[PDB]
Amino acid sequence: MKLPTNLAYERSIDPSDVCFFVVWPDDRKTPLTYNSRTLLGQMEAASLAYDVSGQPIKSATAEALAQGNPHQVDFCHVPYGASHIECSFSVSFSSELRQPYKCNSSKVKQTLVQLVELYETKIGWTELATRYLMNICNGKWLWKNTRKAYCWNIVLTPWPWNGEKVGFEDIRTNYTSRQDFKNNKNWSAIVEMIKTAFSSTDGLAIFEVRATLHLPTNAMVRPSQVFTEKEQNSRVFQSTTIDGERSPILGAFKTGAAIATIDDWYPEATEPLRVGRFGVHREDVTCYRHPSTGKDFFSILQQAEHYIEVLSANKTPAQETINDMHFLMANLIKGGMFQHK
Amino acid sequence: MKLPTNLAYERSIDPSDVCFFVVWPDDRKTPLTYNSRTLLGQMEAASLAYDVSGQPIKSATAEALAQGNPHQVDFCHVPYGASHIECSFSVSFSSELRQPYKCNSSKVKQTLVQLVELYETKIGWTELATRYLMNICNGKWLWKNTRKAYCWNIVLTPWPWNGEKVGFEDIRTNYTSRQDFKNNKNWSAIVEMIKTAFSSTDGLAIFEVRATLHLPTNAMVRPSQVFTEQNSRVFQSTTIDGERSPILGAFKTGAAIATIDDWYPEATEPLRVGRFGVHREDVTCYRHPSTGKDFFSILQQAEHYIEVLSANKTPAQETINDMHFLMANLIKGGMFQHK
Amino acid sequence: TTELKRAFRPLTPHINELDALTILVNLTDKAKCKQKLRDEKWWASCINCVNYRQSHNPKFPDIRSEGVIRTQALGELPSFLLSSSKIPPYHWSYSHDSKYVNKSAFLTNEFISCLGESQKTCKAMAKQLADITLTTINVTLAPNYLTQISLPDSDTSYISLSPVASLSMQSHFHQRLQDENRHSAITRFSRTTNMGVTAMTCGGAFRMLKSGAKFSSPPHSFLVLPNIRVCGATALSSPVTVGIPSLTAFFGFVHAFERNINRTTSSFRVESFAICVHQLHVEKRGLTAEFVETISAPATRDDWQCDVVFSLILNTNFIDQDTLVTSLPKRLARGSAKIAIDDFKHINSFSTLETAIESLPIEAGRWLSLYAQSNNNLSDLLAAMTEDHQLMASCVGYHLLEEPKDKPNSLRGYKHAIAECIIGLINSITFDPNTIFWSLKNYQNYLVVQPRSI
């Protein structure tokens, strides 16, 4: 199947900023604040004592290399008498998945709607909605703040819901595997919301998520930080205004990248990757699903007509060639321009 | 081995700021405060009496040189009727050593991972974890406040722990050598936390440290102070309740836990662990690149250290002190790039 | 020699005829005898450069886009609006090439006219005369990187628009804001030589217009939409100002809400709307673009983002809670727009203006009317800005360069035109009603979201 010169979808999952609050004993809440402070380190860079070729530079003597190097950073910590930290945001599940936002080929637009409706019937939205919801319900969207904590608790508040808010107490002890989420009293009632949202022509499914982090005394928090061009401050946090004060946030695009770490179907899969075209890893600067493999997202769009005859049969669809179906769907939930240029 | 264009680790030890409190008799606690006050000193500079060359400047007569030079400093002291001083912070030990945080080379990543596994299996985490923990358990992180004191007492509260808080009473008398720490009722149980933290893919080990300083009457306390590029001494501070209060910073505290490096080629005093290990008392670098024992010359011998640790022969002290310095800079972290 | 090079470049005011032309030949090299050399090949390279001289730069935010625009704004807008027609159109520059940014200096430096407008001289004039071709537009909407905007033209009809940054305006706001450090907001763009000659002058720093001081709030049939907390919006309302998002984006939020209800109730048809802003907070958050195909990230740009919290009141033509919630549009100028579940109670509909404004919570705010007083210049804008610091310039509408025609690819099958941003000043009312309620007016020459009184 050819790719059109206009094809782009909207995203189906819409997060927000993560705001940080400080809870004092006697239960009053204050927005978390931060300050900048200059520090003094040594003169370690390996560019300050060595040249490009590898030999030691002669200007960097032993006295000149023990001199002291000042740097300015933003520093955010938990106040002394505090009890814990609230962390609140909210997700929607829109189902802009069913139709393209933009298309100029009637043959390709019909091929989408056959793929979405045949994936929905034969395979169903149970597998993907389980994987997204196991990133909300643990502290995946709390990136580094989960690490080095006593315990953290997640409390959901869904909108098309009757009552009795959904709780997830003491992760790192209770909720380790897939089975521990399913043993919750109301887990299938929430998985079947995201299935209801994706499968309807107008599905909404608001969640209101709120965490409770019990840190050590006087401990660090790690918010997200800015990306700017260079013409002294080496670490600048992203922030909002809560009440009348500045406050560190953990951004909306940073939060959406944590819900979408699902992709463990690249050809040598160990760790799940963030869902995207030719799915990259930013830990080690490489590209799994490189287009030479043939398992990036544009080489599966050219097999999209072929995946209709597989789903329209009655034989069991042979797990290797439906891991490509999960990756095909997760990029249309993610959205994006799908042209060549 | 070559240095890649991306190589960076996270730190495996995460301290916090130290908060100072005043304990009164009847055992109520108030945060310590400070004030700025102007003083008046003499006019000593050697730039005011002599020129650059060495002859005396002639505009500085005996009347102009006895005139009075005002300054302004921050001044913190213990209140009068106080009992002692509490100092509390927290340390974590969180296994960032096992794999590099960011590394674009898959060959250099495999080599670094083998070293951390070969080192624990052949040498073990007993030597480093003892040296880090002995800087918590005495007053190393209380830098100059330990000096000129009556006694100081450390109380640990480890987190994956059952009960009976670990106490170290009357340092400068009871805890002087390595054997004095080993004779504590529970020292092996706390060393084996830091060993378990470094040896696991998710090792956590949180400590809650609290000290008790008995100073003389109305005595000085020495907090950490700011770097500014008027007040000549400006303290670092945090807000406790509604009071400004002196702290002893998070990076200052981590510099005291990592004074371990006494393997530099003429070692007398242990140094703060870093690349080309500096000694800022006498402003020089031991472990200069001309020595061949800085950290970037021990990285390029990492493939060599794998055949040494995977043999049955006892490794020599000279080339396992290079392995302690190799491991102590990965616990410290940092960017290890080039070019 | 740098002060001589900056003078012929378009971000400085203009400046013996035998001295000047010998400079312009030496600028094309990467002396008076280098000028006397006359390579035949050199002439046809400079002839291409006067072809790709441009009035308005399509490749401003994105350097991968491709187009040539040498037009003037069509028609003249009133005194309370501002666009490229009022400022004299002569600070035009060169684009499309990175190798020929030096070789364009002979025929495009425009010492006010431009040189681009024995045997070789006759031949050179013939190529220039035949290849001047005044007032051209060369865009292909199929495989490039443009923005596309549908606006409700007239009624039951739409026109696609593509905004393009105007080079005469960018020089005007850059030169005037050298003095004022309070009202300038520097944004840096990478790969400067690929952008154009007008970026190579400033080095990448473009010196936008920042709205005075920080936002503060004094305590100040109809449908009420309260508390639309938007997380990451564009503060870039224009290619010129950084602050609250363009009022066309607030109009798109309302009209997509109008268009979603017409699936169920097909007679809804919002007439006007009113905006009650709380809490701006404009910041320089970045934006990490994804990897593109040899796989890397594209060129980086300074990103200005804002966090608007506001209550929207709409004057309906004449509805269930489940219909009002699911028909809410989920974006306001690229930002996640949401209402809390505890604020779903306050989506009631009222019949009077007094009961609606007493109904909403978060009392301190502003009500956003337009400032209609004679801003024909940035010096006219900044005179209003220094009197009242919270006066908040933004983009108010679009100003066409050419009448809409049929293109082979336009966003959703409509007539396409190329427009430019119109900058207006935005007041605030303590709270009569026609000053507050905004609506989209359609004129042949331009499109502006005006209040109903103006």
What DSSP assignment string belongs to A6-22? -EEE--SEE---EEEEE
Residue B200 Cα to chain centre, angstroms: 24
CB B23: neighbour CB atoms within 10 A? Answer: 16
The three-state secondary structure class of B171 is strand
d(CA B32, CA C39): 81
Entry resolution (Å): 2.9
The three-state secondary structure class of A113 is helix
d(CA C360, CA A38): 45
Q: How far is CA A290 from CA A267, A277, A284, B239, C293, in A?
A: 10, 9, 14, 51, 10
d(CA C260, CA C251): 14
Check: CB of residue C98 under 8 Å from CB of residue C59.
Answer: no
Question: Strands, DSSP E only, in chain A?
Answer: 7-9, 13-14, 18-23, 29-31, 35-41, 69-75, 84-93, 102-103, 151-155, 167-171, 207-214, 239-242, 245-250, 261-263, 273-274, 280-281, 286-287, 336-337
Measured between beta carbons, which residues in chain B are less than 8 angstroms from residue A60?
Answer: 289
Q: How far is CA C60 from CA A242, C238, C254, in A?
A: 34, 12, 28
Write out the two tokens for B304. Answer: 């060599």
Percent helix, strand and coil across chain B, each to the nearest 5 = 25, 25, 50
- What is the radius of gyration, based on Cα positions, of chain B? 24
Residue A222 phi, psi (nearest 5): -125, 90
d(CA C67, CA C96): 8
Closest partner residue to A208 (CB to CB) among C231, C302, C341 is C341
d(CA C108, CA C93): 7
d(CA A18, CA A85): 12
Q: Given the DSSP bridges, would you call strands A207-214 and C438-442 parallel, antiparallel or unpaired? A: unpaired
**Best CA proximity match to C91, nearest among C203, C166, C25:** C166
The three-state secondary structure class of B299 is helix
Check: CB of residue C310 under 8 Å from CB of residue C200.
Answer: no
Distance from CA of C423 to the nearest CA of A (A): 26
d(CA B71, CA B76): 16
Please return the burial class of C115, using the count of CB atoms within 10 Å of its CB with bins 0-12, 13-18 and 19+: middle
Measured between beta carbons, which residues in chain C are less than 8 angstroms from residue A228?
Answer: 188, 284, 286, 302
Q: What 8-state DSSP symbol labels residue B13?
A: B
d(CA A274, CA A297): 13
Check: CB of residue B13 under 8 Å from CB of residue B257.
Answer: yes
d(CA C69, CA C400): 13
The three-state secondary structure class of B240 is strand
CB C59: neighbour CB atoms within 10 A? Answer: 22
Contact flag for B and C (3+ C-beta pairs < 8 Å): no
* Neighbouring-strand partners of residue B69: B41
Distance from CA of B103 to the nearest CA of A (A): 5
* Neighbouring-strand partners of residue B9: B334
**Best CA proximity match to B138, nearest among B125, B151, B157:** B151
**Helix extents (H) in A37-142:** 106-122, 126-136
C341–chain A Cβ distance below 8 A for any pair: yes
Q: Given the DSSP bridges, would you call strands A207-214 and A239-242 parallel, antiparallel or unpaired? A: unpaired
- Close Cβ partners of A117 (under 8 Å, ≥ 6 residues apart): none
Write out the two tokens for A38. Answer: 């200059």
Kindly report the length of chain A: 341
Measured between beta carbons, which residues in chain A are less than 8 angstroms from residue C407?
Answer: none
Give the nearest chain B residue to A51 (CA atoms).
Answer: B339
* Neighbouring-strand partners of residue A50: A56
> Which chains have at least 3 CB atom pairs separated by less than 8 Å from chain A?
B, C
- Close Cβ partners of A334 (under 8 Å, ≥ 6 residues apart): A11, A12, A13, A260, A275, A276
The three-state secondary structure class of B113 is helix
- Candidates A17, A94, A228, partner chain C, best to mutate (most C CBs within 10 A): A228
d(CA C27, CA C13): 18
- DSSP assignment of A27-64 equals S-EEE---EEEEEEE----SSSSB-SSSSBPTT--TTT
What is the rounded end-to-end Cα distance, in angstroms, of chain C? Answer: 52
Distance from CA of C132 to the nearest CA of A (A): 31
d(CA C238, CA C166): 10
CB B4: neighbour CB atoms within 10 A? Answer: 21
Query: Residue holding tokens 């908060």?
Result: B19
d(CA C240, CA C396): 13
Write out the two tokens for B131. Answer: 């040296």
- Close Cβ partners of A244 (under 8 Å, ≥ 6 residues apart): none
> Which chains have at least 3 CB atom pairs separated by less than 8 Å from chain B?
A
* Neighbouring-strand partners of residue C314: C223, C273
d(CA C196, CA A232): 29
Write out the two tokens for B14. Answer: 């995460």
Check: CB of residue B211 under 8 Å from CB of residue B145.
Answer: no
Check: CB of residue A46 under 8 Å from CB of residue B337.
Answer: yes
B288–chain A Cβ distance below 8 A for any pair: yes
Query: Residue holding tokens 């991968």?
Result: C64
Check: CB of residue C229 under 8 Å from CB of residue C237.
Answer: no
Query: Residue holding tokens 């962390």?
Result: A87
d(CA C228, CA C273): 14
Q: Given the DSSP bridges, would you call strands B69-75 and B231-233 parallel, antiparallel or unpaired? A: parallel
B239–chain A Cβ distance below 8 A for any pair: yes
Check: CB of residue C417 under 8 Å from CB of residue C161.
Answer: yes
A220–chain B Cβ distance below 8 A for any pair: yes
Residue C241 Cα to chain centre, angstroms: 8
d(CA A156, CA C303): 33
d(CA B153, CA B160): 22
Residue type, A126: T
Residue C199: its H or E element:
helix C197-200
Q: How far is CA C231 from CA A16, B34, B281, C307, C310, in A?
A: 6, 41, 50, 5, 12
A147–chain B Cβ distance below 8 A for any pair: yes
The three-state secondary structure class of C393 is coil
Largest separation between any pair of C-alpha atoms in chain C: 83
Measured between beta carbons, which residues in chain A are less than 8 angstroms from residue C365?
Answer: none
Q: What 8-state DSSP symbol labels residue C301?
A: B
Distance from CA of C277 to the nearest CA of A (A): 14
This entry's atomic model was obtained through cryo-EM
Distance from CA of B190 to the nearest CA of A (A): 18
CB A222: neighbour CB atoms within 10 A? Answer: 16
Check: CB of residue B188 under 8 Å from CB of residue B169.
Answer: no
Check: CB of residue C215 under 8 Å from CB of residue C279.
Answer: yes
* Neighbouring-strand partners of residue B90: B208
d(CA B65, CA C213): 50
Q: What 8-state DSSP symbol labels residue B67?
A: S
Residue A238: its H or E element:
none
Q: What 8-state DSSP symbol labels residue B220?
A: B
